[model samples]
Target: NTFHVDFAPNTGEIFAGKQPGDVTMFTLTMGDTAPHGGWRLIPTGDSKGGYMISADGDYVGLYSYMMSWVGIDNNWYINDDSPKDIKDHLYVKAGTVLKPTTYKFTGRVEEYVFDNKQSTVINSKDVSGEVTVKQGL
Candidate 1:
């Protein structure tokens, strides 16, 4: 997976770069759903019995309920909750840019359960290579 964030035109300096590992101090906002509206910096297990994280911390799995049901229903109801997953997955790669910041980034968040696996990779030339990245839950 790839994460992309565009900077507003003429929004001054936009710091960009690639970093490996989870990103702290970031937030996620889902356009739809309550309790789902919060700054979560953690990975939840996937329905396929795999642990996963979003390329960008700003996005997590599709509908939280569906993700939960997939595992809860023993895969029998996978199709019922799949549409939302597809939609949310598309949003993750939407390539939409957020407001400019002194430092902005796009990259993968190491899956908590899969430390040796690369869940996603994001590349942006504008990021500062020297910026410090801190891990989070």
Candidate 2:
């Protein structure tokens, strides 16, 4: 799965590698298993599921919720209710709102489905929606 954040920083917000004059594209990739087409999960004391990779080919810090992948209503999703601490590499805090109709991300508090992949690892058979990812304060 690939997570991409495309947004201008909000007022008084300073994201690393971001500037006011330009838009920063925060992109990362994650895979469920080994031999994942040259991209795979590199567990950083995170045993539940996966981790994210930056475009520069470095490991992003881990979010607690990312370590807990589960199936809710028969659909695969990463649990967000237990974000123990904030890690690096651009992650919104846990509890973003998600809509059920088209499974769109409304950006306040609810489960998020990356492209709505049903099985796991957001491979396909998923839904699409806009995300509102804010930096942790």
Candidate 3:
């Protein structure tokens, strides 16, 4: 039994020209350039809370109509859905050469840590370390 959600990302085109139909994304990097490489430690939201790091860097939360949090005993409530102005699909991309991985996360309707905020902690590091992107016509 343990607690770990450390990983904050860096995104672009923040809260400006984003519309309901506009698709956006944030550059993600877990842990810190100096600590556990942004995982397995405490994240300070390095960018003035540009991202969300609860207590320690065990989760990465962002701005929206609502955020994810712990509501009760051993229960995590994820409310990261902001249909108002949220039009971005969060995901991770695997790099070349490869590297070590752990309990990864994302913001997809079908995922474990829906908000990377420990909001819906499946409490398992069953991350696949990959993503599948599709283009439209």
Best by TM-score: 2
TM-score between candidate 3 and the true structure: 0.18
For candidate 1, give the lDDT of residue 136. Answer: 34
Clash pairs detected, candidate 3: 5-58, 5-59, 6-57, 6-58, 30-38, 31-38, 31-39, 32-37, 32-38, 43-57
TM-scores, each model vs. reference: 0.16, 0.21, 0.18
On TM-score, the stronger of 2 and 3 is 2
Question: How far in Å is the alpha carbon of 62 misplaced in model 1?
Answer: 10
Report the number of backbone clashes for model 1.
Answer: 5
The alpha-carbon root-mean-square deviation between model 2 and the true structure, to one decimal in Å, is 15.9
Q: Give RMSD (Å) of candidate 3 vs. truth.
A: 15.7
Give residue 99's lDDT in candidate 2 (0 to 100).
Answer: 21
Best by lDDT: 2
Q: lDDT of candidate 2?
A: 0.26
Query: lDDT of each structure?
Result: 0.23, 0.26, 0.26
- Expressed as tens digits, the lDDT of each residue in 5-99 for candidate 1 is 22121222322233232232233212212111111122223312222232343323222322232344222111221112112111111222322
The alpha-carbon deviation from the true structure for residue 59 of candidate 2, after best TM-score superposition, in angstroms, is 1.6
